[PDB]
């Protein structure tokens, strides 16, 4: 059966090379590159007393939630730097957080293998754990709400899961990864999502049927970050081999490679600008770089973090970038 | 500011105050990463003192946090950076493992990885040698050659245990990191005293290094 699997893999390789007419670099040799995309730290969010592992913007592009090792989930008013909530976590070992698209819920998880859904908008004025989603047998590396009731989580047990939060039960389990799934990104329409794992492969998952539509293998090392292009027909992955790759869903192969000879450190987080021409990747060299996602040119740099930039996100209105880091600060960039 | 913005700022300042108080309280906690290899004597010392087991207890005006993380049956490097700020690693090694296939060679490889990890350059290790009584029962009959063909030493209990322990300190290869080995028989209710002594020595050595006196 291994022979048949290898034959099918070779057939997929031949099909991918068949569709490789002109590389993204050849078709974007004539577009005018943006010279130096220079964001500047507008707000610095202080109040985390440990390394920050995750942050997630609100859909209102003003509130953001940050997860840190000090056992606190803090909701920030990024405009005024006001702390809207400070949620004490039962497990301090949180390495992911998600903010519900409605804003009524926030999720967190990590080494406790449990996704904790927090009801922000309660009749009481406190934030309480509405639902603890247990069932993953590894640490949760990412979680992403589809809506108030559906959340997709990725775990170190090599499986992504879809949860019905009201019942607390896994609606679907997305098996097929061989290494620890490290990140998720839902499509803008949230009908399907990509997940990067330690097997250096990003898989495209259909939410309803639970079937892996496509598998993308371009990286040499552990994929730490993944993010759809704004139109949902492509995505970008960030792996430990210091390179980002732009895979197309329809083309089913990498289109562009975002690597620089000065960069040898791994990539913790990636995100796109609202138009998608910028690919903001957070690196282990303590700063975030900005990439011309169409020309692979390093458009700019986001320096200002004294430790590894573990997470970064762009507002749904594309106005600002928040980059958390292990130095316990979130900086808002414009 | 508006009246509502003023009250929101007041709430934010209250949140900041509570965060600072919680950080002050958490800074007084001595964080220990409790490791081991499969069937090692981790559970015995756990009783003496899901995905991660966190144990809080106070000993001699010191509040310890034991992070038992062996249940994480995945790649360690994907979660070992969470414990970058641990005071020490309480490594458990079953002495009665040289005769079981190899268990203790896997423990030695894990110990080498823990010592040479980029996040544990200056993080001390409180090595515990577990089940030393069964090791003594098994060491008189079977010699210490299955685990160490290069042993070439006396078949005695003390020499065999010292050889295993010394092979363990051999992986330290660091000036700012020390290994505080102890021998345990699973029937001694003073292992937390050994952990406390090791942690006290760790704090004293860190303070001396800050003073330039170490």
């Amino acid at each position, epitope marked *: 059966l291994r022979q048949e699997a290898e034959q099918l893999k070779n057939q997929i390789r031949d099909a991918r090379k068949a569709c490789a007419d002109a590389t993204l670099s050849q078709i974007t040799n004539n577009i005018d590159p943006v010279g130096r995309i220079q964001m500047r730290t507008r707000r610095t969010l202080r109040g985390h007393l440990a390394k920050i592992y995750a942050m997630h913007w609100g859909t209102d592009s003003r509130l953001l939630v940050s997860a840190s090792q000090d056992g606190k989930l803090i909701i920030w*008013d990024s405009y005024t730097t006001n702390k*809207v909530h400070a949620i004490p976590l039962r497990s301090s070992w949180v390495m992911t957080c998600a903010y519900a698209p409605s804003g009524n819920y926030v999720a967190c998880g990590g080494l406790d293998n449990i996704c904790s859904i927090y009801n922000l908008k309660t*009749r009481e*004025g406190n934030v309480r754990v509405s639902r603890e989603l247990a069932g993953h047998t590894g640490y949760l590396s990412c979680c992403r709400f589809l809506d108030d009731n559906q959340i997709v989580t990725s775990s170190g047990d090599t499986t992504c899961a879809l949860w019905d939060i009201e019942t607390g039960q896994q609606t679907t389990t997305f098996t097929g990864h061989t290494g620890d799934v490290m990140s998720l990104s839902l499509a803008p329409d949230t009908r399907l999502f990509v997940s990067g794992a330690c097997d250096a492969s990003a898989k495209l998952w259909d939410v309803r049927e639970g079937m892996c539509r496509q598998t993308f293998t371009g990286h040499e090392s552990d994929i730490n970050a993944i993010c759809f292009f704004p139109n949902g027909n492509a995505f970008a992955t960030g792996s430990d081999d210091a390179t980002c790759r732009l895979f197309d869903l329809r083309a089913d192969q990498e289109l562009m490679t975002y690597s620089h000879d000065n960069i040898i450190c791994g990539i913790t987080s990636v995100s796109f600008s609202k138009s998608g021409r910028l690919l903001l990747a957070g690196y282990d060299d303590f700063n975030c770089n900005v990439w011309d996602a169409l020309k692979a040119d390093r458009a700019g740099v986001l320096a200002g973090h004294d430790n590894r930039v573990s997470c970064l996100g762009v507002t749904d209105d594309g106005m600002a970038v928040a980059t958390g880091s292990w130095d316990s600060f979130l900086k808002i960039w414009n | 500011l*508006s*009246a*509502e913005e003023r009250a929101a700022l007041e709430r934010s300042k*209250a949140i900041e105050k509570n965060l600072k108080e919680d950080g002050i309280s958490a800074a007084k906690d001595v964080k220990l990463l409790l490791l081991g290899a499969g069937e090692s004597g981790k559970n015995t010392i756990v009783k003496q003192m899901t995905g991660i087991v966190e144990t809080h207890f106070t000993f001699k005006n010191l509040h310890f946090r034991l992070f038992d993380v062996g249940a994480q049956r995945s790649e360690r490097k994907k979660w070992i950076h969470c414990f970058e700020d641990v005071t020490a690693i309480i490594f458990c090694v079953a002495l009665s493992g040289y005769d079981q296939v190899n268990r203790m060679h896997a423990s030695l490889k894990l110990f080498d990885s823990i010592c040479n990890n980029k996040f544990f350059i200056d993080t001390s290790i409180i090595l515990f040698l577990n089940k030393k009584d069964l090791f003594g029962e098994k060491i008189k009959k079977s010699p210490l050659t299955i685990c160490f063909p290069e042993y070439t030493g006396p078949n005695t209990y003390e020499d065999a245990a010292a050889y295993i322990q010394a092979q363990f300190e051999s992986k330290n290869r660091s000036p700012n990191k020390e290994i505080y080995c102890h021998m345990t028989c699973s029937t001694d209710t003073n292992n937390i005293q050994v952990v406390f002594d090791a942690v006290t020595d760790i704090i004293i050595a860190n303070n001396l290094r800050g003073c330039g006196l170490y």
Partner: single-chain antibody, 232 residues
Framework: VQLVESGGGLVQPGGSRKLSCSASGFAFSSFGMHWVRQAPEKGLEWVAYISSGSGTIYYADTVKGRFTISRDDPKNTLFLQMTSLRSEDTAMYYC??????????????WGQGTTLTVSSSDIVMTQATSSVPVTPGESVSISCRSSKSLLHSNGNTYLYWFLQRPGQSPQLLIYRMSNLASGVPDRFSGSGSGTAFTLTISRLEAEDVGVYYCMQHLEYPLTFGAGTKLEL
């Protein structure tokens, strides 16, 4: 969630009493609590405010000095220390639950109120309409006027709408102008700009009969408009 006021009763003029609020069912420590009184025939009138943790306190300019608002978080009790009780201090005193952050809904829960009987620059909120006849099933608009623009430099308009249903304490309808309160059916709608506002009800029910109050929360001496009663 319930707020129970105790005390009130009958007091001689110039006397003194303490009003108590036995808050229960919610995280009382995190709420800025108000005292809002309503004269036996008049409309609501905000009395005092003690923030979360007692850090910030305001009083109505007509009760300042005579009244003292205090809270007891461990026992979740809110106090109004009333002294020199003039004849104009007779009213039903409502304790009001209010929490302030981004997106919060202040004034959302009102205590049932306690009756006090005493023997014998501020923004002006105007409700020119009052006691308007309405019929079930038809749309009605309740208007409001403000002396100062309630819209702030941040883009937020601090206009509140409450419903003094007959025999029931006020219940929030729209907390910031055009922001429906929790549990309020989506037929009430708020709109306006600057100083002029309107509360629109799509298909008014039999439960929509009551008295509708404005409130500004821009400058802190919070002022209500004289209620615009709805009757069949």
């Amino acid at each position: 969630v319930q707020l129970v006021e105790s005390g009130g009763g009958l007091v001689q003029p110039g006397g003194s009493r303490k009003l108590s609020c036995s808050a229960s069912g919610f995280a009382f420590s995190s709420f800025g609590m108000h005292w809002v009184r309503q004269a036996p025939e008049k409309g609501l009138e905000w009395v005092a405010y003690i923030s979360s943790g007692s850090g910030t306190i305001y009083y109505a300019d007509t009760v300042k000095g005579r009244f003292t608002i205090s809270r007891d978080d461990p026992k979740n009790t809110l106090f109004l220390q009333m002294t020199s009780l003039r004849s104009e201090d007779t009213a039903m005193y409502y304790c009001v639950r209010s929490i302030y952050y981004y997106g919060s809904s202040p004034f959302d829960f009102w205590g049932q109120g306690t009756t006090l009987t005493v023997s014998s620059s501020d923004i002006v909120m105007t409700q020119a309409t009052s006691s308007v006849p309405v019929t079930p099933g038809e749309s009605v608009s309740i208007s409001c006027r403000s002396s100062k623009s309630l819209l702030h430099s941040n883009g937020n308009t601090y206009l509140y709408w409450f419903l003094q249903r007959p025999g029931q304490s006020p219940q929030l309808l729209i907390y910031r102008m055009s922001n429906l309160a929790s549990g309020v059916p989506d037929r009430f709608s708020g709109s306006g700009s600057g100083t002029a506002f309107t509360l629109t009800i799509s298909r008014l029910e039999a439960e929509d009969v009551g008295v509708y109050y404005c409130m500004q929360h821009l400058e802190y001496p919070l002022t209500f408009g004289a209620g615009t009663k709805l009757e069949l």
